[PDB]
Design a protein around this ligand. Structure first.
Ligand SMILES: Nc1ncnc2c1ncn2[C@@H]1O[C@H](COP(=O)(O)OP(=O)(O)O)[C@@H](O)[C@H]1O
Ligand SMILES: Nc1ncnc2c1ncn2[C@@H]1O[C@H](COP(=O)(O)OP(=O)(O)O)[C@@H](O)[C@H]1O
Ligand SMILES: NCCC[C@H](N)C(=O)O
Ligand SMILES: NCCC[C@H](N)C(=O)O
Ligand SMILES: [Cl-]
Ligand SMILES: [Cl-]
Ligand SMILES: [K+]
Ligand SMILES: [K+]
Ligand SMILES: [K+]
Ligand SMILES: [K+]
Ligand SMILES: [Mn+2]
Ligand SMILES: [Mn+2]
Lengths: 342, 342
């Protein structure tokens, strides 16, 4: 069990219902790095950039390989850092390192000196049987001996999306967090990140549509970025609805969504609309034990009515990008994929 | 002093701060009727339909002569009632009768058996020197004897608008009500009501513009009619701003105004907006001691910053109509006006 606490009051509050204390790196990009070390050298197996930010369990985040936003300069650091760790820890086989990038700054989240659940995905993306190799390394056959020394960077985009069990436990708030709840994952391959994500998204059983009306109800910290997303949704032909505070901000930017009522506000309210299959998309971000408990109805309704929803703005952006792609336009075999690698 | 109470709780409330009790005729048209009685006949001097509903003092209302929305059928009833009254009360010279029309039904508000302040405006509009005629009647010369026996209905519209002293007492809520606060009045002459109104309004020192951004903030009981008004302003080329509840209503009608925060809501709020010259027009209707006192800010700011504002929906419609006219287009002299009378 892990929880994110925002203020002093919040602290106690936890403590009640309730030890390591760690500063929470807000508005940070989470990254996964799987590599192999034989004591001589380090092979970077893969650098994966999570769509959802730090604060949403890596196991429940979608991810990209290669990274789709991160600078080469920054990857390189992470790359260097790993290597440092790999030798220091005396890693012999597979390892995994999780970072957080905030303000062009690389922070260390943790190091797992073993095979991580990311391995298979990378293996598939890169064509390198990381598990086998590392195995061979563990048994005494160096990377140099294996002829696996250079890090592979694929020509295409490899996106991993997860599947959540919420529909099996309705009394639960289908909301992301620091604790992992997913049971499985899917993989999307595309020429473009937008194409890969669209494949992964569909693959994950999403009910996202390429039209209709979107509901936007984001948290403060997001109110500022929501604008561009609304704009993207608007470019696509979506009609917008928005709750008070978010409508305010949109409006202030030249965007007038249709104002909707919260549940305790009037009628109809969001639940009603959701229920009536008024939406095709819902973006809903929240921050705070209270804010969360209070928005619980949106999410529960959304899940129940099968409306694709995102609980992260990062995730909303990706959903948006993918509207530009066509998941059924082109198919490629794993064999072909791997053949494309130089 | 006079006040309008809405519910039991409201009654006590008043009582505290605080007797003739009268049912208030909501959503009713107020009408003024000036006439002369010589004991033999009754001369209808004029039938003036106010713009502002009953509840807003006749002295503080703009008015039209002739009526601009009242059926001939209904007027005729009021004309017959005035007659009945004239003879019954024994009037000899001037009289004024006040009615309220609600649901096609004529209701009597009061009878002033003397010269009313509307007498000069009616004389002007009609070319008939009512005070001079009623004076002769009082002195002994009948209507028949002076050859003033038929009611005059001018070929043009005559609108009267008032001037209020709120700008002299800033600590005062510049809102209309059952008590008269106006100091003076102006007259507008036009080929149509819209033209007469425009001239009256301009005449009144209104800072109304034909473009810009309007702010709509209406009461429940008005949220239905507001839509049409919102549309009218839209047709004109105005951009709309509105508060929550209003925005909700407009939204459901397909009109998506730019959301604006009430003062307690956040930022920016109307006060800020008004202060920063964003609006060129304001429509704010309010009902209830509490509702009123809360909305006080809008009105005060509107007056301080010199934005034209209407505190009645009926007023807003009239303002709307006059946007279609040009009060500088054509001028006419009183001698000319009177010469057009047949
Ligand atoms: N300091 C932190 N700042 C932001 N997010 C963090 C922080 N520590 C952990 N997280 C988030 O919580 C997740 C779980 O943390 P982690 O220590 O790796 O847990 P686990 O033991 O389950 O592997 C991360 O994948 C990340 O999204
Ligand atoms: N029963 C009523 N229903 C609606 N409006 C009314 C009613 N009684 C009075 N009013 C409003 O109050 C104003 C003043 O009432 P009135 O009896 O004429 O007082 P005063 O002697 O000052 O003229 C009217 O011009 C009208 O706007
Ligand atoms: N990979 C996380 C699941 C995505 C889900 N639509 C959410 O945003 O909650
Ligand atoms: N006829 C009364 C003055 C009108 C003023 N603009 C108001 O609506 O309050
Ligand atoms: Cl359950
Ligand atoms: Cl004052
Ligand atoms: K993450
Ligand atoms: K761990
Ligand atoms: K009136
Ligand atoms: K009176
Ligand atoms: Mn972890
Ligand atoms: Mn009166």
């Amino acid at each position: 069990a892990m929880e994110i606490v925002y203020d002093e009051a919040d602290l106690r509050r936890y403590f009640q219902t309730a030890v390591l204390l760690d500063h929470f790196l807000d508005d940070a990009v989470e990254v996964d790095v799987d590599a192999i070390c034989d004591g001589e050298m380090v092979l970077i197996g893969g650098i994966m950039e999570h769509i959802e930010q730090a604060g949403v369990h890596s196991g429940d985040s979608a991810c990209s390989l290669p990274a789709y936003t991160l600078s080469q300069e920054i990857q390189d650091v992470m790359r260097q850092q790993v290597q440092k760790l790999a030798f220091e820890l005396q890693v012999r086989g597979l390892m995994n390192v999780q970072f957080a990038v905030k303000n062009n700054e690389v922070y260390l989240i943790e190091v797992n000196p073993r095979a991580a659940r990311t391995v298979p995905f990378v293996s598939k993306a890169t064509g390198v049987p990381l598990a086998k190799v590392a195995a061979r390394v563990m048994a005494g056959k160096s990377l140099a001996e294996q002829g696996v020394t250079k890090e592979v960077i694929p020509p295409y985009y490899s996106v991993k999306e997860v599947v959540l069990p919420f529909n099996k436990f309705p009394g639960v708030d289908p909301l992301l967090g620091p604790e992992m709840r997913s049971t499985g994952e899917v993989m999307g391959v595309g020429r473009t990140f937008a194409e890969a994500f669209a494949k992964a998204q569909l693959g994950s059983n999403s009910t996202m549509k390429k039209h209709g009306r979107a509901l936007l109800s984001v948290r403060e910290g997001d109110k500022e970025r929501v604008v561009d997303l609304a704009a993207k949704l608007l470019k696509q032909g979506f009609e917008l609805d928005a709750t008070h505070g978010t409508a305010i901000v949109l409006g202030e930017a030249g965007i007038n969504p249709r104002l909707v009522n919260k549940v305790h506000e009037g009628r109809p309210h969001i639940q009603d609309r959701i229920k009536n299959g008024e939406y095709t998309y819902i973006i809903n971000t929240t921050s705070g034990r209270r804010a969360i408990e209070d928005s619980r109805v949106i999410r529960r309704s959304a899940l129940q009515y099968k409306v694709h929803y995102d609980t992260t703005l990062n995730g909303g952006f990706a959903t948006a990008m993918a509207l530009n792609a066509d998941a059924t336009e082109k198919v490629i075999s794993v064999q072909e994929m791997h053949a494309q690698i130089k």
